[PDB]
Amino acid sequence: SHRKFSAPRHGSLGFLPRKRSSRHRGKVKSFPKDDPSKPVHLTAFLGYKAGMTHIVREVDRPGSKVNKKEVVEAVTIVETPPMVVVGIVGYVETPRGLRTFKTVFAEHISDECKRRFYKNWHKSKKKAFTKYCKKWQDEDGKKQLEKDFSSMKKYCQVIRVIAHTQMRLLPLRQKKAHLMEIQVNGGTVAEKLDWARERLEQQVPVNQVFGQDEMIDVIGVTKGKGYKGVTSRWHTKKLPRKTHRGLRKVACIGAWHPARVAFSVARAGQKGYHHRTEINKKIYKIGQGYLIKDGKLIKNNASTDYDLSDKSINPLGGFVHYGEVTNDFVMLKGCVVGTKKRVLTLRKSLLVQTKRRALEKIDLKFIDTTSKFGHGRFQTMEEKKAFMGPLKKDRIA
Amino acid sequence: VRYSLDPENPTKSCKSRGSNLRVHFKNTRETAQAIKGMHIRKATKYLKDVTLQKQCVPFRRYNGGVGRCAQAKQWGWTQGRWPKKSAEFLLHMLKNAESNAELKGLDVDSLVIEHIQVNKAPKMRRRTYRAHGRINPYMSSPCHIEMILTEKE
Amino acid sequence: NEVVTREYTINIHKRIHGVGFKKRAPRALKEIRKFAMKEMGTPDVRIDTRLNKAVWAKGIRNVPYRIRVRLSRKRNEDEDSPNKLYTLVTYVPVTTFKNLQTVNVD
Amino acid sequence: GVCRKAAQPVEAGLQIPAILGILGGILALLILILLLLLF
Amino acid sequence: SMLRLQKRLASSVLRCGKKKVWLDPNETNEIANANSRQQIRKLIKDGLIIRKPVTVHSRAR
RNA sequence: GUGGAGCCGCCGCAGGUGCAGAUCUUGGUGGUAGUAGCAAAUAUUCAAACGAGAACUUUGAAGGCCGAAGUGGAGAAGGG
RNA sequence: GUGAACAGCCUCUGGCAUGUUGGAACAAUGUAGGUAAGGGAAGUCGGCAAGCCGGAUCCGUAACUUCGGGAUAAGGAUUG
RNA sequence: AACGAGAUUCCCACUGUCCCUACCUACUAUCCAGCGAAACCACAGCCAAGGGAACGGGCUUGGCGGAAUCAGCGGGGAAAG
């Protein structure tokens, strides 16, 4: 009784069911609530973390001792091909919560979407949405399709939008689009809904959704670590060396008279692959990738105002265990939940903040594109072979 | 001899028996509840894939400690196993019945397995050696398995 | 129903990896079998002893990283199995694996 | 014999391991761990 | 097709060990017919049982 | 219904006279449970043969071990 | 063969098939073996356990003593 | 003095004893094929409070209560011997 020396609890009970998530893609538990006086806009966006680099930026923080100096900061980069809007879902509020009113999908849905509706695309006849695509052209189904936007406009108070990822534009071997359902939090329900009928089966870029130095929240599923014990799942102190039957165990797992093992005690189980939402991840740059073929290929990513080189943020050797980034990207200060090649939903933040650390501008000075597959010391290939000279690679010509 | 539940039409029914043979009882009971009511051509072909581990036997009653496999989803169960000695002895006995069917003048394209039971045989013992100078038995549990084959028509 | 014959390179250094020191050369031969049953499509694969000696040439735990083999789909006789084709995997030696690619031989 | 591993031998033995199972276990009080309860 | 008897008789009659005996594994049933030491000295002269010499242990280095 | 050669009523007579327990005696069978276990001393692989049937038999090739205070070659005691 | 050596390690003659089973995977907890930045016993009833030290050659060897020792004291330098 | 696998205190060097844990290997464990025990066992097995041989799993009033299981686990069965 009375431990003689107080410690705090090991681990938090706010994340108690340390369970594998029932989803691979991060669910948005809450979209930011709207005032309809704003212009009409999306709130979330799907992305894929490719790998991490770092940065050099001239920091601006009056009061600090870092002020007007250069700081390196770790960034992740999140490759974002543009989303393609497919569906519109209505939601009517009940005294039992929100309830789906009805859904209307696009005229012709793509092929990477229809692969998400199958657990075996190879054994399929690919017969999905064949009867549904006809009612956009058949006049009898079409004059009630225009009714089911007018019933939408009258009754449901929040509408959302079904979009997906263009998985052909990624180096991943997946080709199933990740089909998300995100909320349009703009104006009134007429303007909110005729901004989504306007743009069915069309693309939405990420800079139309997000911006530079606009602090957001990252939602994902963590690095799965497997079945690990108490000293790794909960970070309990190891027992002394002299212990019989085992070091790496929690010794006393309860008293006598509650006569049951409590929920608030630590024991072995599944570590990692949990659903988490990181908060307050500032965006450092919305890069865009690899424009048109007249100017044969502008690589031109990671090219700060002080660099002026023909660099690109895919490093010298490609991103390790990802591939090579050819699309738009978002780069974010700090670590981000997930493995590489993992889907993660970037999302605007609910809370408002000024705080003099958000809302201040950042200008990049430098991005290293040195090799991450070892201890790289060169950044661009011309920078290497000017320092390296000619080699025995040619040796005939 | 006399079987359990004499068939409804002994003219177009077949039967076989094997007594006192060394299989496990708990593995043979549950591979025989898998092929009960099964047609003889699906039954002979199912038993080949148990030996090749392409298709399992769900353990529904004697399931203490039995692991989980993905091939028990066809049976709507979770636990399953692949008894290759047990699925060979009631495959060798299923050959004996279709040898008796053509000696009784029966078509083998309509034979299903009407009745099949496994029940225990008298146990034969030998002994092992445990700590502190003690003897304890390794008794084997053989079985008598028994089947009626009936044409459907 | 062919009887055709090809020659390949098999890198063993890729196909055994993270294997223990005593399981390293015996897995190197049941990964020649799992190569030759995937390619030629028959469960019956015979390898000869000169290909046995070519893997075991340096003990167990140091298998030579890459070998040049040839594979021979053939047919059989004298109350053969329900599959009547089989592969003979034999060993051909070479001093250089660079720029060698799997050619079809006659 | 022609019928001596079949009709001599299955009678010959087949229950001869049955020597008592246990002959007491005279190992003298396995509670050798001194416990002695508060004295 | 046990060749355990012929292996024992040969290493006694060649005055060698059981380790150093007998190449040419083709003629199995010919040498498996021989059961006697008088028969086994005949197979030595036919070259179906040879000596398989001593393993090299050079004192060069 | 099975079974296949003996049995019962009344009047008196006589008991080794009726079981749920005795950590009862003897025999039998369960649950545990198709579980614990089949983890000291570095190591096997390929082909062929014999076979109803070969991870384990024999043979051959390879890689290894004991390394002369041996995992070798002989005995005493004991076994028979 | 190495070496002071019937040490340990490696081979030959002579034996053996890994010690009453295999195959796939490589989670926790163990058992056995290792490493670890900075700190250096703060750990603990206690330096428990592990780790340092180690062969030889050339120097250099204190208190104390029964004048034999202590003593391979301690402390250095070298080594292909 | 010399000698102690003797008892103790300090110091130097040394180190995962520790701050504070991490990673790698072998063997198991794990899964499969074959083979397969024993201990123990009134019946059984979710709680709170009450009363009770004063510390219930069952009784009383409440909280409530879906098959079948797997890997672990050492709170309890005032667990077994």
Ligand SMILES: [Mg+2]
């Ligand atoms: Mg919510």
